Short mmCIF file of C-alpha atoms in Angstrom, two decimals:
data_model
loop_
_atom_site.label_atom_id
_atom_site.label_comp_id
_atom_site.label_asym_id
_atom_site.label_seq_id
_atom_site.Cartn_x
_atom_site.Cartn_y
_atom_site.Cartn_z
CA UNK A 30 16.77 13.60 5.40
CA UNK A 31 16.02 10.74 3.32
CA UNK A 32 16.23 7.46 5.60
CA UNK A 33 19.10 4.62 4.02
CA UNK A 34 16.95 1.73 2.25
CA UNK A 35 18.41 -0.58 4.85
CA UNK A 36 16.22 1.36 7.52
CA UNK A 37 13.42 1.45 5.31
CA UNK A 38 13.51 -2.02 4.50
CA UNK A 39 13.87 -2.91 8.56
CA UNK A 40 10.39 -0.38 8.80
CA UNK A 41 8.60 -2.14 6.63
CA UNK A 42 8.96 -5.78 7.78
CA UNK A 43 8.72 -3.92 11.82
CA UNK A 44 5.12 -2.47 10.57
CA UNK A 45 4.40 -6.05 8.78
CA UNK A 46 4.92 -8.27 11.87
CA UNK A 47 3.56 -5.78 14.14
CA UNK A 48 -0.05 -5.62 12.51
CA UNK A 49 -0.65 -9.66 11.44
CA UNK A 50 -0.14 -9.97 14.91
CA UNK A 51 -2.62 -7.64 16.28
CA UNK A 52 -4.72 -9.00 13.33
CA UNK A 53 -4.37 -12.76 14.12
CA UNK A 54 -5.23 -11.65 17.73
CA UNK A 55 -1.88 -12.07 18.98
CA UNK A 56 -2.44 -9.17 21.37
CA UNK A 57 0.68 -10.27 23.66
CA UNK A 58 3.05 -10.41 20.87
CA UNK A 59 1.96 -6.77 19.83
CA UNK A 60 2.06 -5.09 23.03
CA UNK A 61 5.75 -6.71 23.17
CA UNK A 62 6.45 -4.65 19.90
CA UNK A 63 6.20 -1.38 22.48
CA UNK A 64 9.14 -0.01 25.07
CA UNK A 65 7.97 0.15 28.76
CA UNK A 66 6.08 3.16 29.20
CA UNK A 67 5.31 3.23 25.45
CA UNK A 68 2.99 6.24 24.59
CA UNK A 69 -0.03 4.99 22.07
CA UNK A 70 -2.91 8.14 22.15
CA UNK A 71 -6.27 7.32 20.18
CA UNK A 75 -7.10 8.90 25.60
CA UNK A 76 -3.59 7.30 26.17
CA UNK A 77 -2.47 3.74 26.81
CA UNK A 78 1.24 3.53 28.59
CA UNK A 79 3.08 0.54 28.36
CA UNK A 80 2.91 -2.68 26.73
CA UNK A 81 0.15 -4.12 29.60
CA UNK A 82 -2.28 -1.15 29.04
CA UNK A 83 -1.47 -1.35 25.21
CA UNK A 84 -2.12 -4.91 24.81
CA UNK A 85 -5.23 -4.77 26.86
CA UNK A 86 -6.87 -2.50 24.45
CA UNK A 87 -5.97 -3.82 21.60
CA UNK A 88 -7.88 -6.58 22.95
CA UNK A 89 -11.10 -4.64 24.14
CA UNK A 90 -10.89 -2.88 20.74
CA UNK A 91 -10.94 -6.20 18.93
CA UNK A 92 -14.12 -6.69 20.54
CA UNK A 93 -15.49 -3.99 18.17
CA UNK A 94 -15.13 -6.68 15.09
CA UNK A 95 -17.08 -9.57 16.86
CA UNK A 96 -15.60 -12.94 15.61
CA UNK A 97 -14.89 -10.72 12.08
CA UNK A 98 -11.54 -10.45 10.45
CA UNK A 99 -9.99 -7.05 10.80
CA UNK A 100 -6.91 -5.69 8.28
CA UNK A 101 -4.51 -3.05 9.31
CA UNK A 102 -3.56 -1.09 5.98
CA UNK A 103 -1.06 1.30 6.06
CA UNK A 104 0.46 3.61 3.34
CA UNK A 105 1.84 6.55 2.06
CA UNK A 106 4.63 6.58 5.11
CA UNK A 107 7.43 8.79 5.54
CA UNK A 108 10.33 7.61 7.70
CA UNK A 109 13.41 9.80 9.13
CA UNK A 110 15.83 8.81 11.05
CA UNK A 111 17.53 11.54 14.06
CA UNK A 112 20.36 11.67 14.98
CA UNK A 113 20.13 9.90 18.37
CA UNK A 114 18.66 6.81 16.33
CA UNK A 115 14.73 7.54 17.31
CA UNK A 116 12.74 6.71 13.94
CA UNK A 117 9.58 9.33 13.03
CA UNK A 118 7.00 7.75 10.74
CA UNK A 119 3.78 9.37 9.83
CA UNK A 120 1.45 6.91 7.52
CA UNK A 121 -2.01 6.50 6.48
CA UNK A 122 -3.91 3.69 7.85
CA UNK A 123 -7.05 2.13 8.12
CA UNK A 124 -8.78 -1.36 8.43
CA UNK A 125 -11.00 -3.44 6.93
CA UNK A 126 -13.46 -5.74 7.87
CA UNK A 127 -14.47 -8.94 6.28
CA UNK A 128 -17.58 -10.78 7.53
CA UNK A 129 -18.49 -14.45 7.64
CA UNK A 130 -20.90 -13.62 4.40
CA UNK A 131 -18.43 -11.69 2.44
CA UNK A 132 -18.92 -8.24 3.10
CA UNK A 133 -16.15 -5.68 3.27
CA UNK A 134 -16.25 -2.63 5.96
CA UNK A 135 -14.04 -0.15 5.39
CA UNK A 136 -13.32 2.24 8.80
CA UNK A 137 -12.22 5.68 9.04
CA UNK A 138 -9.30 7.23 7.85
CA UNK A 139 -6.37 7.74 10.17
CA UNK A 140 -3.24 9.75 10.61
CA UNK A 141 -0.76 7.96 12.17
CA UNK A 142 2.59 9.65 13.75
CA UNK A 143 4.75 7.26 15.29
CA UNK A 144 8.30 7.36 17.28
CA UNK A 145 10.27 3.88 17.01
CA UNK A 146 13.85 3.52 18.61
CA UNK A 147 16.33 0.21 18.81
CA UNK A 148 16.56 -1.80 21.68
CA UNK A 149 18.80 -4.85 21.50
CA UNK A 150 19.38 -3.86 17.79
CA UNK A 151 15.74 -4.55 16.98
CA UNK A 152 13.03 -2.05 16.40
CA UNK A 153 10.16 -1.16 19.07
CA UNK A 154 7.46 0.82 18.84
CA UNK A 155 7.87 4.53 21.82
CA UNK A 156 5.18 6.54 20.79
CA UNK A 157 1.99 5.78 18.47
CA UNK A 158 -0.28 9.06 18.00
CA UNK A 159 -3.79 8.26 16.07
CA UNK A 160 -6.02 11.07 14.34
CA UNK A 161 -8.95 9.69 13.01
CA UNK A 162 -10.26 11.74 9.67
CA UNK A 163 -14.10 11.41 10.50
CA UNK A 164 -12.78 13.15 14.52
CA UNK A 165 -10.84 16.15 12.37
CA UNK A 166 -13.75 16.71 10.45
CA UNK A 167 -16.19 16.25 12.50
CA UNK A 168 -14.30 19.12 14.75
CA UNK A 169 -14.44 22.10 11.90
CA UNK B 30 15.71 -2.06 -15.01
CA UNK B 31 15.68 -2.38 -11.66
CA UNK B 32 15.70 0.18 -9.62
CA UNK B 33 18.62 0.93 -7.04
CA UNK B 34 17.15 0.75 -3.69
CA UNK B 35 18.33 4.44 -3.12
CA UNK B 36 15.91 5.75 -5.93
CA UNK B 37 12.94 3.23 -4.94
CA UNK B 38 12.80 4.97 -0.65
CA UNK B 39 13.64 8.56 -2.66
CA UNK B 40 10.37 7.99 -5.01
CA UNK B 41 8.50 6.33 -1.87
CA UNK B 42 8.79 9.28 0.21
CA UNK B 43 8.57 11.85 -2.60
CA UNK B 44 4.98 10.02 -3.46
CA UNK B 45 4.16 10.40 0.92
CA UNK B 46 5.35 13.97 1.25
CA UNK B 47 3.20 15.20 -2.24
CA UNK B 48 0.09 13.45 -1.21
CA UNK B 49 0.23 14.60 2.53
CA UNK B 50 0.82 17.78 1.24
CA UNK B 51 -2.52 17.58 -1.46
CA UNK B 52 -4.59 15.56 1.26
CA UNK B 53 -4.15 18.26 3.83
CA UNK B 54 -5.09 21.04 1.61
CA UNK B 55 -1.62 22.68 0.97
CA UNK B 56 -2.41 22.73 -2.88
CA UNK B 57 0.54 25.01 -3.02
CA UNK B 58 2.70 22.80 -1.25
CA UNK B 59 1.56 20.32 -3.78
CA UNK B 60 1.91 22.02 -6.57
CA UNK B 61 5.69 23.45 -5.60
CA UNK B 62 6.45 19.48 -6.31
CA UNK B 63 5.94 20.20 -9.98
CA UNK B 64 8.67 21.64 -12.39
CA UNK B 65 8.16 24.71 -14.44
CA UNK B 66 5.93 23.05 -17.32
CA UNK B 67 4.76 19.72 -15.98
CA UNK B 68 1.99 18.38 -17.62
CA UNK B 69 -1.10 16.55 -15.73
CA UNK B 70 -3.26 14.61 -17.91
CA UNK B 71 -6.49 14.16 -15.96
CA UNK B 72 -8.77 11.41 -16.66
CA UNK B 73 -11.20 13.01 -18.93
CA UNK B 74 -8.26 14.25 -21.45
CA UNK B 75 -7.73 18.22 -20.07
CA UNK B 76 -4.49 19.05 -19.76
CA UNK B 77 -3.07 21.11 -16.69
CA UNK B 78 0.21 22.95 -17.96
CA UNK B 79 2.70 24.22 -15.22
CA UNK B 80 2.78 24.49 -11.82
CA UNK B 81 0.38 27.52 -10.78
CA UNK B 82 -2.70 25.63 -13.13
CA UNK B 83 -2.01 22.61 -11.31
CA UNK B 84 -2.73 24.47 -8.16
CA UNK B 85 -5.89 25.88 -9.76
CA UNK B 86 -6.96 22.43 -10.45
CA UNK B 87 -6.25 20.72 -7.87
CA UNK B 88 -7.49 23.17 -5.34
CA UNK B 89 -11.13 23.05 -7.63
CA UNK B 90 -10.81 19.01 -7.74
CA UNK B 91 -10.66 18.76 -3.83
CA UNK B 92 -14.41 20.49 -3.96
CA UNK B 93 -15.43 17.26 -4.65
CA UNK B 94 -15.04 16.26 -1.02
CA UNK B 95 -17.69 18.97 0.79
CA UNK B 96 -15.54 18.89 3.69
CA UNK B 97 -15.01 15.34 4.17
CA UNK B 98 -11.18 14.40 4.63
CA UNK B 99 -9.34 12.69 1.52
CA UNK B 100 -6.59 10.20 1.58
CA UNK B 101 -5.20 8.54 -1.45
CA UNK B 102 -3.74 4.85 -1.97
CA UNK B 103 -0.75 4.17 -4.26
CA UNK B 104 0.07 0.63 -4.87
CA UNK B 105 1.60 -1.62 -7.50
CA UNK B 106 4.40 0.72 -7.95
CA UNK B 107 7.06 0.34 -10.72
CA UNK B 108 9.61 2.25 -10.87
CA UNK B 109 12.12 2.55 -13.96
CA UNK B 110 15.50 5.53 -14.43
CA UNK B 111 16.75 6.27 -17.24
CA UNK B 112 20.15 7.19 -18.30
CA UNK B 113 19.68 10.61 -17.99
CA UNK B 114 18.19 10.30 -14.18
CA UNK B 115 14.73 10.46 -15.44
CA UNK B 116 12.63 8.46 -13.45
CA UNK B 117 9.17 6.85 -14.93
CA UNK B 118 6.89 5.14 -12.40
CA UNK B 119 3.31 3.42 -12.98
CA UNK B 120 0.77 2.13 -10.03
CA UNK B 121 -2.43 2.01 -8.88
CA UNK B 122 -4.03 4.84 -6.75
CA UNK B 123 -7.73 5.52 -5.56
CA UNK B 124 -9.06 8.22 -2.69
CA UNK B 125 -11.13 6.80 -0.09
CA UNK B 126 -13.48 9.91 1.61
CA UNK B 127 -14.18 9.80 5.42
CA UNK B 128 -16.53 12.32 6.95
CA UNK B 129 -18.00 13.55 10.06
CA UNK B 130 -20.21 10.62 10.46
CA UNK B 131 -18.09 7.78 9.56
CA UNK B 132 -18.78 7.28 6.28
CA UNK B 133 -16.09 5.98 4.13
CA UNK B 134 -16.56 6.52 -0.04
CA UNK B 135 -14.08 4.79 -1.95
CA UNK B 136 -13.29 6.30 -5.79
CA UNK B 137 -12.96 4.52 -8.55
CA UNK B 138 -9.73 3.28 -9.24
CA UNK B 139 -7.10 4.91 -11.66
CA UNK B 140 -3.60 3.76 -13.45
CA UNK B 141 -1.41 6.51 -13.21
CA UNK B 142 2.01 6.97 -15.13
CA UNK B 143 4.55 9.70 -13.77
CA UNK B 144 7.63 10.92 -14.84
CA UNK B 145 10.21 12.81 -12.24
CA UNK B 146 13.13 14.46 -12.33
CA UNK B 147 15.73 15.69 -10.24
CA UNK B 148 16.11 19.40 -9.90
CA UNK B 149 19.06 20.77 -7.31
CA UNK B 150 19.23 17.30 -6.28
CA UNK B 151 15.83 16.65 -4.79
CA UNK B 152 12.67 14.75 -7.28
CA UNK B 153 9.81 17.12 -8.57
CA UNK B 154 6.98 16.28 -10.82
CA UNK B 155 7.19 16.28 -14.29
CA UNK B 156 4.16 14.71 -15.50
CA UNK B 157 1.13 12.88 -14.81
CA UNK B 158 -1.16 11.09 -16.84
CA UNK B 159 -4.70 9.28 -14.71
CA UNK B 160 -6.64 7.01 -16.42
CA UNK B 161 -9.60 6.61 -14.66
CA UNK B 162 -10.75 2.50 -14.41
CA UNK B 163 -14.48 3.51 -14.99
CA UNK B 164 -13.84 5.56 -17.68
CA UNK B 165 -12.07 2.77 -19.14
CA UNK B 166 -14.67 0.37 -18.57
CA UNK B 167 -17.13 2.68 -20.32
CA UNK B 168 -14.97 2.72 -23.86
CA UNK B 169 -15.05 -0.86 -24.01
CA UNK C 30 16.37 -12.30 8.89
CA UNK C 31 15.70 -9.11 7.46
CA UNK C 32 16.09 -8.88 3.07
CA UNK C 33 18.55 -6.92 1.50
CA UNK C 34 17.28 -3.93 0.34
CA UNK C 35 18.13 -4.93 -3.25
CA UNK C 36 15.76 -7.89 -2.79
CA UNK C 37 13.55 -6.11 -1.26
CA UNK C 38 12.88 -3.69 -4.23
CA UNK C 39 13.08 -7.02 -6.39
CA UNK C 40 10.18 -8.43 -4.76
CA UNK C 41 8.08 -5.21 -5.00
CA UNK C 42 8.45 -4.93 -8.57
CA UNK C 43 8.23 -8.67 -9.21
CA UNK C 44 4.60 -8.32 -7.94
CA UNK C 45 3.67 -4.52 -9.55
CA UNK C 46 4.81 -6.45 -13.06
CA UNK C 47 2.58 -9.63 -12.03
CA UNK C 48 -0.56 -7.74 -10.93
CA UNK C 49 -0.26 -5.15 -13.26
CA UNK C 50 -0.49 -8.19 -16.37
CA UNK C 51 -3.25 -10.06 -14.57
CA UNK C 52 -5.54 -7.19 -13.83
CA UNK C 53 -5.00 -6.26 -17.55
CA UNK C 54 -6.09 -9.30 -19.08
CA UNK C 55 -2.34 -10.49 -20.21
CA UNK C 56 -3.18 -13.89 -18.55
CA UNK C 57 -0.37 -15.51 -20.60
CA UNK C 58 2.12 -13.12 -19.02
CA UNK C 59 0.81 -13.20 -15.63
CA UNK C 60 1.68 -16.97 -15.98
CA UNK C 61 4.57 -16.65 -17.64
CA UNK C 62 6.11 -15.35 -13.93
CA UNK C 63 5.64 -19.09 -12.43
CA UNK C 64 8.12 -21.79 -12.38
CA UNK C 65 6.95 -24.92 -14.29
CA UNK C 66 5.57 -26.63 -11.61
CA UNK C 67 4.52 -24.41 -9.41
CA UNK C 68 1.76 -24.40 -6.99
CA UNK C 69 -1.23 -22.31 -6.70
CA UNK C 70 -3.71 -23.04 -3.61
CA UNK C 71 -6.97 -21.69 -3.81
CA UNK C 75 -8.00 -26.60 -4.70
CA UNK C 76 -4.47 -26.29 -6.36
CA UNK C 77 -3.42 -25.49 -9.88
CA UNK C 78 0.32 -26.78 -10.69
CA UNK C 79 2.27 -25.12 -13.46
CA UNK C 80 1.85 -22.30 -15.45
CA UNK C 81 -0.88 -23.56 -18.08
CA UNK C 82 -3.32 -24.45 -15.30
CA UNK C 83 -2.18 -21.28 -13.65
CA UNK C 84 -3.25 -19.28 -16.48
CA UNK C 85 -6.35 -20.89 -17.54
CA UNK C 86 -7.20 -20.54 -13.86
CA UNK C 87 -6.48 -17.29 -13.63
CA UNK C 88 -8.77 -16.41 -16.87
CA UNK C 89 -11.72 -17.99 -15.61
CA UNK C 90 -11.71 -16.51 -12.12
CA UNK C 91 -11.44 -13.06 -13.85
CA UNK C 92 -14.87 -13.57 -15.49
CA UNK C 93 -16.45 -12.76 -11.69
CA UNK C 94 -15.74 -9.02 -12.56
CA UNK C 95 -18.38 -9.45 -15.50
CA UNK C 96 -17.52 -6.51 -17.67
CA UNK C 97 -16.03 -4.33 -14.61
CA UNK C 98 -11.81 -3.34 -14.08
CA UNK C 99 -10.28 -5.11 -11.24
CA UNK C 100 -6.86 -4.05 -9.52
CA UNK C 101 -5.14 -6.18 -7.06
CA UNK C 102 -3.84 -4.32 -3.59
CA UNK C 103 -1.16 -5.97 -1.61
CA UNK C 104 0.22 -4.43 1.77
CA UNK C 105 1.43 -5.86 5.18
CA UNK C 106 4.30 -7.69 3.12
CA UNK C 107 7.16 -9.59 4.77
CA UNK C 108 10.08 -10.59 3.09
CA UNK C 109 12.68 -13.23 4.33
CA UNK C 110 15.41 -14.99 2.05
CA UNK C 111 16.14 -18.67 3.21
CA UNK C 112 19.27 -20.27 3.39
CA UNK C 113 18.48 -22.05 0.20
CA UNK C 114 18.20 -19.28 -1.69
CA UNK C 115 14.29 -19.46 -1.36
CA UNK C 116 12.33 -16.25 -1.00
CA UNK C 117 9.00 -16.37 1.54
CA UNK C 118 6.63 -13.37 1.74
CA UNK C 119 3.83 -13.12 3.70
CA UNK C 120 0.97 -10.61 2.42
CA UNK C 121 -2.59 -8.94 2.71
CA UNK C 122 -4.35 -8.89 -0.57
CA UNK C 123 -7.78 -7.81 -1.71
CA UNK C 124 -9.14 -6.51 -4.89
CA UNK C 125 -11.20 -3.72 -6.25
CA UNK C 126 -13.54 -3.83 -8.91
CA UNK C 127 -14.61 -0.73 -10.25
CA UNK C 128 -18.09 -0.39 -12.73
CA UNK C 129 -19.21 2.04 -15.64
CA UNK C 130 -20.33 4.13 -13.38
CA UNK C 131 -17.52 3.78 -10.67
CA UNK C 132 -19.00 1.64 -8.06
CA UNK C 133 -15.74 0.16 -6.47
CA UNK C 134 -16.79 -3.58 -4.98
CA UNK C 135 -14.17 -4.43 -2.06
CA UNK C 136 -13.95 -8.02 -2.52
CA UNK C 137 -12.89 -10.07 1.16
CA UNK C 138 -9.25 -9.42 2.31
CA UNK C 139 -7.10 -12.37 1.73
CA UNK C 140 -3.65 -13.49 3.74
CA UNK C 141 -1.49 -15.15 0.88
CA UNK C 142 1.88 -16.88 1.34
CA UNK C 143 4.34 -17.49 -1.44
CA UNK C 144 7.27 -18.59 -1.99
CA UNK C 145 10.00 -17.11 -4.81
CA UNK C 146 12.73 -18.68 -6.40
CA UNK C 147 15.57 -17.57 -8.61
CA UNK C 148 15.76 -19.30 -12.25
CA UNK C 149 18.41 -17.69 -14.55
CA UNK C 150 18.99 -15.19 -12.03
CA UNK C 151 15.30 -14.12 -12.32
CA UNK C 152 12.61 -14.38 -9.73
CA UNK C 153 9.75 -16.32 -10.47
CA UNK C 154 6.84 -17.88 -8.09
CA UNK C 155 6.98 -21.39 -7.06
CA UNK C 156 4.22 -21.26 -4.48
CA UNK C 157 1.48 -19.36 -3.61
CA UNK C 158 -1.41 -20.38 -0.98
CA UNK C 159 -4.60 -18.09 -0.48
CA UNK C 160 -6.21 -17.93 2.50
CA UNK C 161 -9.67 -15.97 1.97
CA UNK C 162 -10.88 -14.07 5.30
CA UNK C 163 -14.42 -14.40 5.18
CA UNK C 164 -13.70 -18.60 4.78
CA UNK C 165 -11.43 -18.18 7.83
CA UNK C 166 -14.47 -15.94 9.93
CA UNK C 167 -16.89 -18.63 8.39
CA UNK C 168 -14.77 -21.66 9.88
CA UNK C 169 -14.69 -20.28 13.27
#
């Protein structure tokens, strides 16, 4: 079922806000994008404290670089009991003091996203990262 | 010109469910997107004509990889209908290439043109045309 | 808050057409979608001309090669003024002869649209280059 362009609109500006602020470090503001007891599986984080946390510890990982959530090629339905499914490419890039671009694995990104207070949140975040698949056949 | 915002989320998640479908190796899948006909114009000037040589070629194409996982990148999407419901759509696309040890290859860029059209209600494939960027470096 | 889905789709095809005619060398048309006036922040160019001439020398960097411009992570909010405000990540390829793709450093860009004639066209835009940002901290 095809979702109405006002949810797809709303999607896109939840997925927007979401990643500058886990880009700009804001790692409070995007745990508070996730429902308590919010499911996010790289190993599984629950809730918006464990979430936040390592988004933090995984920012480590850049040193003081600047990382770029890029997503694309997303599918969005809507159930009928509101809960949104997404499934999306993503990946991030990394841009050094000097210049220099990284580009990380591939991932496969299934999501669950349901209204609270008329406002999306983020229920359920499921990563597969392409180099893990293919490294496992 | 513009298009209604019912057509642009229709051609947005057409464009998601085809390339999931070619990136995870359901070339049939893929190639069920395409009418009875289609023409794909790949970059070198062949010409793949209906559905099941589509299949053929893209199943070949994704040889290429050696295992390593594909994903391709649309961007820079316009999106025109015509009259009749035909729908013409141009934007940028390129395939990065992850494999078992992290490495990440990035293709070269293409412009791609499309044209779809709605068959029992739903959008398939009519054609595709790729012009490859370094190809089109090389000419001039 | 959120865009109406009709402006939405405006604002993605107001910046396909743009990119599209300054990655393919129509420099003139590229600054033909500014506002007399406007502002571009690299040092700032105002108005289209400036725009344009800008525009034509920064291209020569590719030396020979076919850039393509890829935004993502784009926010859209329409102001009570009738003032559009989008929020982006940009970077751009550059692709060789013998397809080498160059990833140049990710930018965060914020413009600002306005409606002239019923058209939109960009009064502002202000480019803030990542590996600057890393540098400066």
């Amino acid at each position: 079922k095809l979702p109405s362009p006002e949810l797809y609109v709303e999607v896109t500006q939840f997925y927007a806000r979401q990643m500058h602020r886990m880009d700009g470090d804001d790692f409070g503001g995007f745990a508070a994008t996730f429902v308590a007891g919010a499911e996010f599986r790289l190993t599984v984080l629950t809730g918006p404290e464990a979430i936040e946390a390592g988004a933090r510890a995984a920012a480590g990982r850049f040193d003081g670089a600047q990382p770029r959530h890029w997503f694309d090629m997303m599918t969005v339905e809507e159930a009928d009991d509101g809960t949104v499914s997404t499934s999306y490419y993503a990946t991030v890039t990394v841009t050094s003091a000097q210049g220099a671009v990284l580009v990380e694995p591939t991932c496969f990104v299934r999501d669950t996203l349901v209204r609270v207070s008329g406002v999306l949140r983020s229920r359920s975040r499921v990563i597969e990262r392409d180099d893990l698949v293919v490294r496992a056949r």
